């Protein structure tokens, strides 16, 4: 199969900016590549075919060009509707295959996460489960890592994370990380720790509780 590598996988940009997205195929595709836009929530619209040709209804601030295994898409004077995900697709050979997309996101200032940790509720504990929740809210940029510790020991199994789309009013991201344990194991440890590593700090933001308190 022809493998389509799309660069970059995301981009933070402002209205009026010019943006440039590229696509690499694992083999020469002789301009049999198109470009697609998926607005957020929405369906797709075909932008460009044959490397460089506009589909009908596509404004001329969209343009592409390439040769061989390397092709780009340029969007000049970005408008608010242009914030969307963009994919290239090759149709030089079957099966037809897609790049992984480039998300156009809105630029804002760096913001630290507000980190909050919560112990299992009694009620949950009643039913034999114990989920430890940690919100990491209103941060920027979207790159973040979350580490759990139980009595100092780092913990990977049982962690599930869920990220929101870029916020429509402030343009930050949030995640929840949930550490799910049996009520049994939970009652066997004291300190639960959720650490957020982010760009806006040289050092993790730590939040903690003790099972034994209160």
């Amino acid at each position: 199969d022809i493998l389509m590598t799309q660069s970059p996988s995301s981009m933070s940009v402002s209205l009026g900016d010019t943006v440039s997205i590229t696509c690499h195929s694992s083999q020469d595709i002789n301009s049999n590549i198109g470009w697609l836009q998926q607005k957020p929530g929405k369906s797709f619209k075909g932008l460009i075919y044959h490397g460089t040709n506009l589909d009908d209804e596509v404004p001329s601030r969209f343009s592409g060009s390439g040769s061989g295994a390397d092709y780009s898409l340029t969007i000049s004077s970005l408008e608010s509707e242009d914030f969307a995900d963009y994919y290239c697709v090759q149709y030089a050979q079957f099966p037809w295959t897609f790049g992984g997309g480039t998300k156009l996101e809105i630029k804002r200032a760096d913001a630290a996460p507000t980190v909050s940790i919560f112990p299992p509720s009694s009620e949950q504990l009643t039913s034999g489960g114990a989920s430890v929740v940690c919100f990491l809210n209103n941060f920027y940029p979207k790159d973040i890592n979350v580490k759990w510790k139980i009595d100092g020991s780092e913990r990977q199994n049982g962690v599930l994370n869920s990220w929101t789309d870029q916020d429509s009013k402030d343009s930050t991201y949030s995640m929840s990380s949930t550490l799910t344990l049996t009520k049994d194991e939970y009652e066997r440890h004291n300190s639960y720790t959720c650490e957020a590593t982010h760009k806006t700090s040289t050092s993790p933001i730590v939040k903690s509780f003790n099972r034994n308190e209160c």
């Binding site: 075909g46 075919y49 697709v89 509720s121 599930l160 929840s176």
Partner: protein, 216 residues
């Protein structure tokens, strides 16, 4: 202005056949183009499934070759997808699209969930700070919503009288059922002095659970 619209079941049990219809208007499926099925997985990756050309010839992605069939009905101007032996990794959004001058015309997409689950109302657990961690200026509360099906709960904080930093986190599959959470940030003196209440609606199971959030 060439329109395509998908229809068919959006819930299919594993090992049954997923089946869908694309309904074309404003152009003839006999007259030009390839008529395609493309699916988008959760996490957004795209996969070309196959097509049937205007002359009725088919091509299928070898990755699905043994379980895919694409057909049409020239008199209704319709083509169809059937996808046998589905499993939960066949949960995706299905699009039919015309190829020819790239991929200009797309249907609106239809998500199809492949699940063995039965309708299940959620368990709703309130999320309040564990005492000890005395706080600053704002206070973050939440509700954890576990073990429901099908998807679509709506978490309304007060009457919506709050979207002072209401965050809704996308559901994940956990144990065959869905789990999501919601957070809400309020000033650290509006609570606990005021009632903070998270109301969780699951219309598929005709159920709404309200939790009033409690200190310590």
């Amino acid at each position: 202005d060439v329109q395509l619209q998908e229809s068919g079941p959006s819930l299919v049990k594993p090992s049954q056949s997923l089946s869908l219809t694309c309904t074309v208007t404003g152009y003839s499926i006999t007259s030009d183009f390839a008529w395609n099925w493309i699916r988008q997985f959760p996490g957004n990756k795209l996969e070309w499934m196959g097509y049937i050309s205007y002359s009725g010839n088919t091509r299928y992605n070898p990755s699905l070759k043994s379980r895919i069939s694409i057909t049409r009905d020239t008199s209704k101007n319709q083509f169809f997808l059937q996808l046998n032996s589905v499993t939960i990794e066949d949960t995706a959004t299905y699009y039919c699209v015309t190829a020819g001058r790239g991929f200009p015309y797309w249907g609106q997409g239809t998500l199809v969930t492949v699940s063995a689950a039965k309708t299940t109302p959620p368990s709703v657990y309130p999320l309040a700070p564990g005492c000890g961690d005395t706080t600053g200026s704002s206070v973050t509360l939440g509700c954890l919503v576990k073990g429901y099906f099908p998807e679509s709960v709506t978490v309304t904080w007060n009457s919506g009288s709050l979207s002072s930093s209401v965050h809704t986190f996308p559901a994940l599959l956990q144990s065959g059922l869905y789990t999501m959470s919601s957070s809400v940030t309020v000033p650290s003196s509006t609570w606990p002095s005021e009632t903070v209440t998270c109301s969780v609606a699951h219309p598929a199971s005709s159920t709404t659970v309200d939790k009033k959030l409690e200190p310590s």
